[PDB]
């Protein structure tokens, strides 16, 4: 499913991301924009053989099981395919664990390089939230 910007903002808000670990909703929407272009079905292979899945491009190296990432963990206790669903519940719940692990949103390289320090509020402008 390819979310609209405000549609995704609304779903992220309902699921508790707004100000989660101190990160305003615009941070999460900006991250999703540059990670996946709001596409829940997005996948990308990493150089190390792990794969990133879903709207927030969650990595099989640590967070989910895809059966093809040797030596990896499954800290969110989910198949990576759960992260591709039209329902963002699994991605949000796993994202909450990632952002709590010490590095905050710096875990998402595209957030660090493209969202951090910018006017992220722009990403939720106009939405009925
Ligand atoms: Cl914001
Ligand atoms: Cl594996
Ligand atoms: Cl932080
Ligand atoms: Na894994
Ligand atoms: Rh808000
Ligand atoms: Rh890499
Ligand atoms: Rh399985
Ligand atoms: Rh649901
Ligand atoms: Rh839902
Ligand atoms: Rh502004």
Curated annotation (Swiss-Prot):
Major subcellular location class: secreted
Presence of keyword Signal: yes
Residues holding substrate: 101
Gene3D superfamilies linked to this entry: 1.10.530.10
Keywords of the record: Allergen, Antimicrobial, Bacteriolytic enzyme, Disulfide bond, Glycosidase, Hydrolase, Secreted, Signal
Catalysed reactions, as listed in the record: Hydrolysis of (1->4)-beta-linkages between N-acetylmuramic acid and N-acetyl-D-glucosamine residues in a peptidoglycan and between N-acetyl-D-glucosamine residues in chitodextrins
Membrane-spanning intervals of the chain: none
GO biological process: cell wall macromolecule catabolic process; defense response to bacterium; defense response to Gram-negative bacterium; defense response to Gram-positive bacterium; killing of cells of another organism
PROSITE patterns: GLYCOSYL_HYDROL_F22_1, GLYCOSYL_HYDROL_F22_2
Domain C-type lysozyme: 1-129
Assigned protein family: Belongs to the glycosyl hydrolase 22 family.
Subunit structure: Monomer.
Primary role: Lysozymes have primarily a bacteriolytic function; those in tissues and body fluids are associated with the monocyte-macrophage system and enhance the activity of immunoagents. Has bacteriolytic activity against M.luteus.
Name listed for the protein in its UniProt record: Lysozyme C
Organism: Gallus gallus
Organism phylogeny: Eukaryota, Metazoa, Chordata, Craniata, Vertebrata
């Amino acid at each position: 499913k390819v979310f609209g910007r405000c549609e995704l903002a609304a779903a992220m808000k309902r699921h508790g991301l707004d100000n989660y670990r101190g990160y305003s909703l615009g941070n999460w929407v900006c991250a999703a924009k540059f990670e996946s272009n709001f596409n829940t079905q997005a996948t990308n292979r990493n150089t190390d053989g792990s794969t990133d899945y879903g709207i927030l491009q969650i990595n099989s190296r640590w967070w989910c099981n895809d059966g093809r990432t040797p030596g990896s963990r499954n800290l969110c206790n989910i198949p990576c395919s759960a992260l591709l669903s039209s329902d963002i519940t699994a991605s949000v719940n796993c994202a909450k664990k990632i952002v709590s692990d010490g590095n905050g949103m710096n875990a998402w390289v595209a957030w660090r390089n493209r969202c951090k320090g910018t006017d992220v509020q722009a990403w939720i402008r106009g939405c009925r939230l």
